[PDB]
Structure 1
Amino acid sequence: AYTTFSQTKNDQLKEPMFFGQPVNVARYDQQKYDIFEKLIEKQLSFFWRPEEVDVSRDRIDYQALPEHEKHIFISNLKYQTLLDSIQGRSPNVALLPLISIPELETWVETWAFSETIHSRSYTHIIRNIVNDPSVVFDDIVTNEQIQKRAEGISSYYDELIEMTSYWHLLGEGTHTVNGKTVTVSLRELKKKLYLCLMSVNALEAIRFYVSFACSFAFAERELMEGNAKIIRLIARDEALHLTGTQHMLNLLRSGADDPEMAEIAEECKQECYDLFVQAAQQEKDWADYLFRDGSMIGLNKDILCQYVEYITNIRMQAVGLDLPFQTRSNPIPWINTWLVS
């Protein structure tokens, strides 16, 4: 029931962000929510090319690293690579079929495109630091600890996509498919979208930021500086991406965009809270493992657990959730040097 060009003339300023009439004309002279047009403009202004960053000294730095620090560095880079592989395709496959205002549709396609640049930059780094990149890329898919740390991200997107297909094909109701009852509920689909957007917010606003702490701890020691320059550009984009999901989530919960969505958000406040705490716990578990063969220099599992708690509290407060952790000031203020946002 989805269409690439809805033939009904509609007022795009009055449609909800999601589940309304599919967007027909792509226009940018007006918007329901100007934050999305501002984000498109900023992201276009930040366009960068990975190939332009010099990573020629990173190979020697990496080879000089102690084995446990090589492990920390490459494990962290593999996780960044996994997250951006998912983020280049997923916002497009999962959200585009559900968006009903043009500025949000183009923001999603712009956001997803920017993630493909991030994926291209990891290839540029990897190719310049190991003789055979396949060694690194082939360990991402079945790497035990990576799977563990990112567990559940692909499932939230996959479940939302499956439910969306059933809704577009069959519509609301109680259906049968090959002898089994299949219930399609718009309310349940709205809940799946909300929890998925909350997960994306945790992904870009907490999972990536923990990864930036690792990358920039090397930059502080003047090591892996090509990687550092790339991660700096990636973090500048991720700040926009987190800004977009925070606004989506706050507009949905306030009730100003879709009243039903506001009721749904309040109804799963406890679920949302526990999923954020679970994301935090997975990052802690990763840090504990990664810093087992030996803590790095300027970073260790305890400093990293503290940073995870610090940033989780900030991000949860930004979308109206209670704080799960003791409040403290930033345990690694030096990181602000690198987060030019």
Structure 2
Amino acid sequence: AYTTFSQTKNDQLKEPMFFGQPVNVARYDQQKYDIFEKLIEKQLSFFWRPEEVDVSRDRIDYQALPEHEKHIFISNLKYQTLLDSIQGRSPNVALLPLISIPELETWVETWAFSETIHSRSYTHIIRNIVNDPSVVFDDIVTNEQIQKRAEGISSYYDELIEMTSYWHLLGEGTHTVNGKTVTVSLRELKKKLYLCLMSVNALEAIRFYVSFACSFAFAERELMEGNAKIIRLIARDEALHLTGTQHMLNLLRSGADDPEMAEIAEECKQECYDLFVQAAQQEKDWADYLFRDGSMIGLNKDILCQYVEYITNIRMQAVGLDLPFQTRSNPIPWINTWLVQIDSEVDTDDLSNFQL
């Protein structure tokens, strides 16, 4: 039931964000939500080329990292490469079918694009630090720790894509395939889309920011200068990502775009809360396995976990969820640095009036 070009002359301003009608014409002279239009122009201006960056001195700085400190770096780098691999494709795939507005169609595609560039930068950083890049890449697949992550990210994107396919091949109503009974309800399809965005947010708001701390950690040590620059650029572009997702959830939880979705959002609030806590927690456990073999000035397993909570509260409170962790100050204020002869006058009469 999907078309790359909808024959019907629908009004792009009235059409909802998702589940509406396949965007036919691409016009930008008017947007229903100028919020997205701003993200596009802002994202295009941050266009960067991973090559321009000088990463050459990073080859010697990294060789120097004691095998455990080389653990912290290489390990954190592997996870990031995994994160934007998925953020490479997931957006367009899951996002695109559903979008029914042109401002947003183009945002998602531009958003997914910026992610490919990030996946490219990592490849440019690895080849400069290590001798055989294959040694690192082949590990992201086999590392088990990556596996709990990878599978989880895939699941929500896939779970949403699956239904989206049925909503087009079958549509609303209960349908049967090879004896089996399939129930396709737009109400459920909206939950997956919502829950999915909740994961995309936490990933691009908490998951990614938990790795930047380690990336910039070496920067404060004047170590890995090149990598510090690249990662820094990714952070800037990353902000726009988490922002768009938030604006997208609020409009759905506020019943602004779709009246039904506000309700749906209220039903998943509890499930969405456990989601952030789920990821927020996984962030802690990984950090323990960041240092299994050691710790290095600045990062601690202790000090790092503290940041995880601090940011989780800010990100969750942004979408509209109860703070799971205690209130605390920024455990690493240094990270914010990467995010963004005189006059002689004598009078007798004037003083003569003063009585002693």
Give the TM-score range, shorter chain: over 0.9
CA contact (8 A) 1:166 1:184 kept: yes
Shift, 1:236, TM fit: 0.1
CA distance in structure 2 between the aligned counterparts of 1:326 and 1:112, rounded to whole angstroms: 34
SS in 1 for 2:141: coil
Structure 1 residue 170: Cα displacement: 0.5
Identity %: 100
Q: Displacement of 1:207 after TM fit?
A: 0.3
List runs of 5+ in structure 2 lacking aligned partners. Answer: 339-355
Contact kept in structure 2, 1:149 and 1:286, CA below 8 Å: no
Once residues 324 and 268 of structure 1 are traced to their aligned partners in structure 2, the CA distance between those partners, rounded to angstroms, is 16
The Cα of 1:149 is off from its aligned counterpart by 3.7
Q: Deviations over 1:56-93 (max 9, x none)?
A: 00010000001101011001000000000000101000
- The whole-number CA distance in structure 2 between the counterparts of 1:120 and 1:93 is 20
Structure 1 residues 104 and 27, CA gap change in structure 2 (3 angstroms): same
Deviations 1:105-147 (A, max 9, x none): 0000000000010001001000101111000011011211111
Q: Supply the distance in 2 between the matched residues of 1:308 and 1:151 (Cα, whole angstroms).
A: 21
23-32 or 148-157, larger mean C-alpha shift: 148-157
Alignment partners' CA distance in 2, 1:152 and 1:206: 15
Within 1, Cα distance between the matches of 2:291 and 2:246? 31
Cα deviation code 1:10-49 (max 9, x no counterpart): 1100010000011000110100000100000000000000
Matching residue of 1:54: 54
In structure 2, distance between residues paired with 1:288 and 1:296: 13
DSSP-derived class of the 1:191 partner: helix
1:73–1:214 Cα contact (<8 Å) kept: yes
Q: Deviations over 1:263-293 (max 9, x none)?
A: 0001111100001000011110000111121
In structure 2, distance between residues paired with 1:15 and 1:33:
11
**Does the 8 Å CA contact 1:149/1:283 hold for their aligned counterparts?**
no
Provide the C-alpha distance between the structure 1 equivalents of 2:197 and 2:107, rounded to a whole number of angstroms. 14
TM-superposed deviation, 1:8: 0.4
- RMSD over aligned Cα, in angstroms? 3.5
Counterpart position of 1:87: 87
Q: Count how many residue pairs are aligned between Structure 1 and Structure 2.
A: 339
Three-state SS of the structure 2 residue aligned to 1:182 is strand
Distance 2:147 2:280 in 1: 15
TM-score (norm 2): 0.94
**Equivalent-residue separation in structure 1 for 2:169 and 2:77 (angstroms):** 40
**1:148·1:282 contact (CA, 8 Å) conserved in 2?**
no
Deviation at 1:148, TM superposition (A): 2.3
Q: After TM superposition, what 4+ stretches of structure 1 lie above 2 angstroms from structure 2?
A: 148-151
> 2-side partners of 1:14 and 1:176: how far apart?
34
Distance 1:151 1:328 in 2: 32
Give the equivalent residue in structure 1 for 2:66.
66
Per the alignment, residue 164 of structure 2 pairs with 164
The superposition leaves residues 174-201 of structure 1 with CA deviations (integer Å, 9 ceiling, x where unpaired) of 1111111111110000000000000000
Bigger shift: residues 143-152 or 255-264: 143-152
TM-score normalised according to structure 1 size = 0.98
Q: Counterpart of 1:131 in 2: which secondary structure?
A: coil
Following TM superposition, by how much is the alpha carbon of 1:150 offset from its aligned partner in structure 2, in angstroms?
Answer: 4.3
Note the C-alpha offset of 1:216.
0.4
For residues 296 and 148 of structure 1, do their structure 2 counterparts lie closer, same or farther at Cα, with a shift above 3 Å needed?
farther
Deviates more, 1:170-179 or 1:142-151: 142-151
Structure ID, larger Rg? 2
3-state SS of the aligned residue for 2:330? coil
Q: Which runs of 5+ in 1 are unaligned?
A: none
Q: Specify the SS of the correspondent of 1:152.
A: helix
Say if 1:172 and 1:185, in contact at 8 Å, map to a contact too: yes
Aligned to 1:200: 200
Quote the offset at 1:151 in angstroms. 4.4
SS across alignment from 1:139: helix
Q: Does 262-271 or 150-159 show the bigger shift?
A: 150-159
Any idea what SS the aligned residue of 1:119 has?
helix
Aligned mates of 1:58, 1:91 — CA distance in 2: 32
SS, match of residue 189 in structure 1? helix
Q: Shift of the alpha carbon at 1:296?
A: 1.9
